[PDB]
Amino acid sequence: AFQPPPKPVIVDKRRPQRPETRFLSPEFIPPRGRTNPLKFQIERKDMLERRKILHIPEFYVGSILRVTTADPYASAKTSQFLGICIQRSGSGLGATFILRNTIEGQGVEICFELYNPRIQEIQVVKLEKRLDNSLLYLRDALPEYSTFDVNMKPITQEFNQEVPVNQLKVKMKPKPWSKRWERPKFNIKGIRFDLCLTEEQMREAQKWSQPWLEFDMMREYDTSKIEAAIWDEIEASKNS
Amino acid sequence: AIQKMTRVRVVDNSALGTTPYHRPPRCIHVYNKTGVGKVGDRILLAIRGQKKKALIVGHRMPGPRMTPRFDSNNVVLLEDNGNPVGTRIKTPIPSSLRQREGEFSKVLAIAQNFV
Amino acid sequence: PVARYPPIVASLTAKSKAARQRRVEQWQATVHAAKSVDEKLRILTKMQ
Amino acid sequence: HGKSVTWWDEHLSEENVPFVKQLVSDENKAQLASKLCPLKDEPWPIHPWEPGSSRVGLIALKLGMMPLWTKDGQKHVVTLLQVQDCHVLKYTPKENHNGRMAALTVGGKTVSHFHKSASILEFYQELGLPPKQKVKIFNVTENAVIKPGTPLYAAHFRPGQYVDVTAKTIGKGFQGVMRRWGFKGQPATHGQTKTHRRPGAISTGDVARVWPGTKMPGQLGNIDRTAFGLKVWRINTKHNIIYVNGSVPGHKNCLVKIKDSKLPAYKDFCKNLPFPTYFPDGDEEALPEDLYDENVCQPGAPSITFT
Amino acid sequence: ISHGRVFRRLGLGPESRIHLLQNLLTGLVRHERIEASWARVDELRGYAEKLIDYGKLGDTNERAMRMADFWLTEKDLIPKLFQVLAPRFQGQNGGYTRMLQIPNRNEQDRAKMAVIEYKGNCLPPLPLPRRDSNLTLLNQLLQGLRQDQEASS
RNA sequence: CCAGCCCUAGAACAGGGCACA
Ligand SMILES: [Mg+2]
Ligand SMILES: [Mg+2]
Ligand SMILES: [Mg+2]
Ligand SMILES: [Mg+2]
Ligand SMILES: [Mg+2]
Ligand SMILES: [Mg+2]
Ligand SMILES: [Mg+2]
Ligand SMILES: [Mg+2]
Ligand SMILES: [Mg+2]
């Protein structure tokens, strides 16, 4: 029997210079409330101890994941679900992410909890960013943007692609939608408005714009030192 | 969350669920002590101008975590004895319905997909 | 790499005399950008 | 004699303010370290446990809420109560307090000396401890009395137990009748004029008055309430944190009075618990960092799967 | 119920409050010391601190440039903000402003008035409340206590 | 003890904090 040779990497730091950037999952960022930081420290220790067993990978809103959950009433004790990440929300041990997929013409959304012990394995089959941090408009979008092959193979990516952002404009179903995605409070760039809405509709939707919120300077949440401390704790836990 | 006057979608293959009609099948009465129905709750419908019983399969209101949320208020038609009138169900079904098999045995026996 | 400072012109919608002069300059620039002499005379004598 | 108002910073200098601060800080640190070994100076006689005994409680701080999963897949919500500085301040005898049970006074987290009255400061100086914020009274039996001045820790409660939690709820101010009593309003737009949230009729015409039990708008929230039968799941001994099941009345960072559950279903549960209190120096062996219940999915778990 | 609210309602709404604070910030940047209502100045102090931080962020920063362009209505103050106020606040971290309550307005409204001032300005110093000297009776007693504590170590 | 300053406390008056940092 013969085995073929592996393909090693030919990184040459000489001609191309490429550094490396840190990625902190959104669940570690504490909310803006006046909660005692001791609770956040306790929750961070708990979620790090949980991550020591369950490998929670890096994935953004728009990536396609496959989650294996422990189901007692199924044929096999495991149940797989593949879908695109609609949104990631929550802080600490209760962080959740929404997976959406069209199965036989019926669109299904499941809100999985990251640190639930019933989750066996999470697999990012396509690490991929999109034009919006929350693409909840896929409910009102055409079904083709929600259908994904449940048996699709994982796509492996190399580090030097820095999470390619998918600039995909999405077609829309006729009005009305689940929400008024044309309002400035959503700030949506992933919907092809020029083919579904009209000029007067856009002008009427622009009446709800608040241009002072981007220059308020007091509604911003600066978490530089918080993120630095969280990263220090993460490195300490990884070394321990 | 399916309550009175809610227009539902029949999922199983039945004459009442397939034959078109000038009025969509609305909900008449929910058999809970509260007026709101959830997955696995018996309900009454007025389909094609007659009263029928149905079982709530899926709805659009979010529920507990790790539970499926569908894009339509799906229902499967039932008889008075508790047996389904349809032959098979094509749309997916919440896996939590298999927890109570004592009352939904013949309904789950015709279900094909579980989510 | 280079500083991009906004111009030091006065406001346009303010009550100040500088804002009034800027609006005067604005309508005079409209007259300048006018194409036909008929349009020039119309914009110059439309106020009564 | 028109004496003027004064505070501790009025007559101090730019150099004496930090000196005063550090002096009070070192005095508080020394006073709190002196009471760290209560079982070796002069502890009161420890009595055995009896079936009709009642235990003392603690005064913790409501940190926040956290999800917590059980081995059967269920997900509960726990509230974290941190016992910062719990000390038994005074003890009133049974015949001098109630004639049925004695009273133990417990103090909460430390506060500043510069904002208390002369009597409270004298009491705390005689006791030998820095002042506490919240001071509560617990009805204990005569055999569960502890010497005043002893510290109490969260390991007083063990993983798997039912507790009672008393606190002042979140005060919503002068609220209307619809938010205070859950009254239904009138229709929104079918002709009603300036009545969409009024209480409506308040009494009957023949009575010619309104009854004292009439529900009417007023204060809502700033009152003491007690949650009964909250299960404890986890005890963090390093930080002195208790994980009580469910919701706890009161906002976060507030003082909460915790005690054993007085429900008739959990009246004889104190048999296995440390009867007088938890003395960390009596065992001479440190407890684990986290004491969990027999059903809690600990953070380090095999990621349970059904069979 | 206004639990956890940090901004007070001013003007004819949120946008009007933003515009009022913007006018106040422009005046403060221009004159280095202004006087207004106590509530408006207390609301403006944080915006002034954040503006000094954005000015310290640098001239070539497009974010800071557009923030200054929005806030400073008089466009001759942006070079001032970037070349006078920010350079002179370098070793300092957050001590950029000083707010002091002055007596109530002599007008009939009797409004509670404050004065805000950027530290290190070319203006007569306000009559700041100075603490007592160490030669006071109580301060000398505390000095004796401090000396005893130093000798005891 | 309550001048002032904050508040998950409040119409006003009341009530809780202002030493760690
Ligand atoms: Mg809707
Ligand atoms: Mg008919
Ligand atoms: Mg309140
Ligand atoms: Mg109503
Ligand atoms: Mg009328
Ligand atoms: Mg009306
Ligand atoms: Mg009328
Ligand atoms: Mg009478
Ligand atoms: Mg007080």
Short mmCIF file of C-alpha atoms in Angstrom, two decimals, chain E residues 5 9 25 49 65 72-73 86 88 96 101 103 124-125 128 145 149:
data_model
loop_
_atom_site.label_atom_id
_atom_site.label_comp_id
_atom_site.label_asym_id
_atom_site.label_seq_id
_atom_site.Cartn_x
_atom_site.Cartn_y
_atom_site.Cartn_z
CA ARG E 5 -30.95 56.87 33.16
CA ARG E 9 -34.23 65.67 29.26
CA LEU E 25 -19.55 73.02 23.82
CA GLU E 49 -14.04 65.57 28.36
CA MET E 65 -12.08 65.21 12.51
CA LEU E 72 -17.75 72.73 16.97
CA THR E 73 -20.24 74.86 15.04
CA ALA E 86 -5.29 68.77 22.87
CA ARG E 88 -1.76 71.14 26.38
CA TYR E 96 -9.68 68.58 31.68
CA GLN E 101 -21.63 76.23 41.27
CA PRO E 103 -24.70 81.88 43.21
CA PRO E 124 -8.14 85.07 36.11
CA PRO E 125 -8.42 82.05 38.42
CA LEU E 128 -11.50 78.13 44.31
CA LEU E 145 -0.80 61.80 65.15
CA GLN E 149 2.60 56.84 63.51
#
